[PDB]
Scaffold this motif. Structure first.
Motif, mmCIF file in Angstrom:
data_model
loop_
_atom_site.group_PDB
_atom_site.id
_atom_site.type_symbol
_atom_site.label_atom_id
_atom_site.label_comp_id
_atom_site.label_asym_id
_atom_site.label_seq_id
_atom_site.Cartn_x
_atom_site.Cartn_y
_atom_site.Cartn_z
ATOM 1 N N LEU A 162 0.826 -1.200 0.000
ATOM 2 C CA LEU A 162 0.000 0.000 0.000
ATOM 3 C C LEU A 162 0.864 1.256 0.000
ATOM 4 C CD1 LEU A 162 -2.933 1.153 0.253
ATOM 5 C CD2 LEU A 162 -2.477 1.102 2.699
ATOM 6 N N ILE B 105 3.334 6.850 4.794
ATOM 7 C CA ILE B 105 1.987 6.357 5.080
ATOM 8 C C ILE B 105 1.683 6.451 6.577
ATOM 9 C CG2 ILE B 105 2.550 3.916 5.340
ATOM 10 C CD1 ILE B 105 0.091 3.246 3.862
ATOM 11 N N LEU C 4 -6.899 5.638 1.391
ATOM 12 C CA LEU C 4 -6.059 4.503 1.766
ATOM 13 C C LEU C 4 -6.861 3.212 1.813
ATOM 14 C CD1 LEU C 4 -3.698 5.681 4.621
ATOM 15 C CD2 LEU C 4 -3.067 5.216 2.267
ATOM 16 N N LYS D 127 -7.945 8.662 4.726
ATOM 17 C CA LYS D 127 -8.370 7.392 5.296
ATOM 18 C C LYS D 127 -9.215 6.611 4.297
ATOM 19 N N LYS E 125 0.738 4.223 -2.720
ATOM 20 C CA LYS E 125 0.389 5.580 -2.309
ATOM 21 C C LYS E 125 1.488 6.569 -2.687
ATOM 22 C CE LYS E 125 -2.265 8.612 -0.812
ATOM 23 N NZ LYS E 125 -1.976 9.338 0.443
ATOM 24 N N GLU F 299 0.562 9.901 7.191
ATOM 25 C CA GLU F 299 -0.790 10.116 6.684
ATOM 26 C C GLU F 299 -1.849 9.507 7.593
ATOM 27 O OE1 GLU F 299 -0.542 8.940 2.573
ATOM 28 O OE2 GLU F 299 0.972 10.517 2.236
#
Lengths: 68, 66
Positions: free
Chosen positions: A39, B42, B55, B52, A43, B45
């Motif tokens: 992830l 991350i 993600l 949120k 991102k 974040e």
């Protein structure tokens, strides 16, 4: 069809990873540390492509290299 | 101290491109460094409670593709 990756990480980085996995996880959905890595890669690729974070990413990177 | 992660060919391509983008003739940024950076970013974040939903959507798509 699958690539394997090997990463050495700091105790700070490992703690961050564990905390992120618990935060994203729920009773309904489990998020492994490996999934948090995948992830994070997606991102950050999005942020690099969208061109808004590269200054902060560079400050984070410079501090990261200094610690290493 | 060390971690081993299984990642997708698409995800590996994204990591490679990210490594080259961050790199320069003066500074080399490895794939491992991009992963450390990505974990740190991350975590930040998550701390600010922003994206949120973004993600979690990226997570849902990631899992569907696994």
């Amino acid at each position: 069809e699958k690539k394997r990756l090997q990463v050495v990480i700091s105790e700070e980085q490992d703690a961050l990873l564990t905390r992120a996995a618990y935060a994203l996880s729920s009773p309904e959905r489990a998020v492994s540390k490996s999934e948090v890595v995948r992830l994070a890669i997606e991102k950050i690729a999005r942020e690099l492509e969208e061109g808004k974070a590269k200054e902060e990413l560079e400050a984070l990177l410079k501090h990261l290299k200094a610690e290493e």
